[PDB]
């Protein structure tokens, strides 16, 4: 009995937008993790805890969207645990920045893999979602996150004591 | 002779095309019969009237379109027979929006008809045009209908009276 | 079981009406291919293009008033295929002008003839209705249409290559 | 080593702080999972849909508040899995809600047993802070929730269809 | 040693890019040529000039967002020469359209050999970005120029020598 | 046969302003080179990118105004190969500022050749066109730049990793 709607939606593209759903919830829990950890009394980088803030919230916006598409398509969401962070401390500014940069690679690959799939299954619409709302947006995120990477390494983080400090002021505070 | 603006434009995807410009045309017509009969003094349901009226203009515009982008590439726009509804008396509210997710499902699966031919002759602006400006509308109006089909057969249309004298109120008339 | 509106509305009157709107229908597609064709690269006459798409949405404007007069005394509407227009090349500027001058003055006549179908059956409210929205709109169209095609024959058109290009910028264009 | 800010702060509410922000996120994603049940095209409840929504971001800002506690009193924020809701589907609007009673029910027994734990601690910050932030909140939502089933009941959901539809329209549309 | 950000893009499609920068900024010099030749005293059509300068700075827009992209990437800007335009003399307004016309179907050509090798190489957001911002605005353009060809072929340019200054002024001055 | 409009304007001069259009092109290119190179993700310093992308734009404008001078007074525009700039890598922010020295004062140095042959040439509206556009620029250009050369070094830069980005946000941001 499939939904009314479903046309064109293999059941693997449905399970593996599942799996997306998880993932993109997990980045929101780990951009939590990291905010939190620079709101601290003992790292004290507002910006850097605003910065990742937003990312969390933005990566809970992707969840949703992937859920409404799900529903869209006939899809049904089903939920997984989403698993706790892999640290409690991140240790510093640039270490934090090293971790998005992963994790936003990691879920760059899948999203491509997602496409991969859509596109083995001739499903257009599923592609070109991905390719609107997900593929650019990693990309410039992995960009900005590799700029800011860059940046702290020079200035010479985690070491150089005033580097975290200013790169909060300057690049995350405005 | 072809067109001078003619490049990697499949003689295929225009005739196809020109298939696809009937259909939107016909389904404007056929929303248009559905929107004629709500308006009956023995139907009298004007927020159906107005919600298929706005239907029949959108697949007009969508027709416009695909004359533009025939126009566009150098293809030639060779018009055929609008050919009747199959029905003059859609019965009820809730058969209307079951035959209109019927209409616009059998709409949806002959643009990834085109899409897949698009693809095929490797015609990605083609194939971006059908993602972009159908693909997404088709897949957003499939599940609107389903939506609606959904609340009237739960309200207890046809039979229930008020089903879709509320309906036309409540979903239709906001 | 006739409709509980229905008043001095006889059936030939109701089948007349039928027809008019089919043709009015028609000449919307007429409209609507000649406006495609000037958007053709190998044509390109813009306000041409724009002037015959008005004329094709003021053609379905006509047709859907028909409709609402119809429910609205209580006759039923009845759908019948709407013909593709005689050619798919109008040749020329002004040819699509003679074309479309000849297109109207058919309209008219036979809205002559259901003006005086509704005389002869006594139904003065189907009369007013012709006579008001319709035949005053039908003679100004003829006029403007005359006007068109005398300006461009004496500008030189077709044969005279800056006839259509001129008369497209400030006939047209304004 | 204990914080430089932290100043009568037991560990066991730093742990039963920990335990909260959990149960917080648990929460919102318990709403999440209701939102999205009725974002499906065959049970399409919007306003049912946003509500819940709302109360998913609600309980989100507020395990973020216990967050900002933790780092404020010097205590550090050890997160947990987010177990996933106990169910997929949410059957109705009324069972939903119902479920939501029981969820909000829960939270705030937690709140009363760490509220508990504050006062035997003699930590009238932390008792503070619950009082004014959490329990007042508590007993609103749980008040609502009462009040959304009891409507939802005496409209006679889920079996009467129209009682869902019309609540969705009247309550939740409000 | 790739770069810290540099995911599924192949060292083809890198290559690929840096000759499209070159093409874009070749295309932005040719048009730059014709936009000088038409602010000659002996040619004086302002127009014209103004039409290929905007062209010139648009193509160079076009450039500096693939050198965006290849840095978005990871990939590595390599410049070459820009060589200088066939021709100083481009002898009329539509022999400058004519030449602008085959340039934009060359560059059209180019880009659908790069969207090619994104697809070959599985690279979707390449294949993205070239379909949002570069196949849709050449097609206008070429599209565009086609009908300026045909216009002026039309009114008899560039014998017939108000030709080319009443489409200066008419089409090219609005 | 000279151009109607040519007086007082030696070949020389003409064969001049000719190739220094071409050197101001090249300048352009140098800048672009530059700008893309600050937006490398392993560089990323965006007001350096900035800063450089408006010299690239100034560069070509003062090409262009050239151009415009070069048809004013009836010369002819011949256009050259823009050679590639020397370097893809520029190594650092003070490097690129000290190459950007270089670059103006050659520039400059080619002004004032082609002032002195204007002299020269009894070319006074030459003369003044170079003086009043160019001369003043490039002094300016050249002290703004040594200006940011004495800056940098000062700051330590490239071996102080704060140097230039401090000098990206105070200097250069704003
Ligand atoms: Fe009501
Ligand atoms: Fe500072």
Not at 4 to 18: F, G, K, L, P, T
Not at 131 to 138: H, I, V
Request: hydrophobic share 35%.
């Amino acid at each position: 009995s499939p939904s009314q709607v479903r046309q064109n939606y293999h059941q693997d593209a449905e399970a593996a937008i599942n799996r997306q759903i998880n993932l993109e919830l997990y980045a929101s829990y780990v951009y939590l993790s990291m905010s939190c950890y620079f709101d601290r009394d003992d790292v004290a980088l507002k910006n850097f805890a605003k910065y990742f803030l937003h990312q969390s919230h933005e990566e809970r916006e992707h969840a949703e969207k992937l859920m409404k598409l799900q529903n869209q398509r006939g899809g049904r969401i089903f939920l997984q645990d989403i698993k706790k962070p892999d640290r409690d401390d991140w240790e510093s500014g640039l270490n934090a920045m090293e971790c998005a940069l992963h994790l936003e690679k990691s879920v760059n690959q899948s999203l491509l893999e997602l496409h991969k799939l859509a596109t083995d299954k001739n499903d257009p619409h599923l592609c070109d979602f991905i390719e609107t709302y997900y593929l650019s947006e990693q990309v410039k995120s992995i960009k900005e996150l590799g700029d800011h990477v860059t940046n702290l390494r020079k200035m010479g983080a985690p070491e150089a004591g005033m580097a975290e400090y200013l790169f909060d002021k300057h690049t995350l505070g405005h």
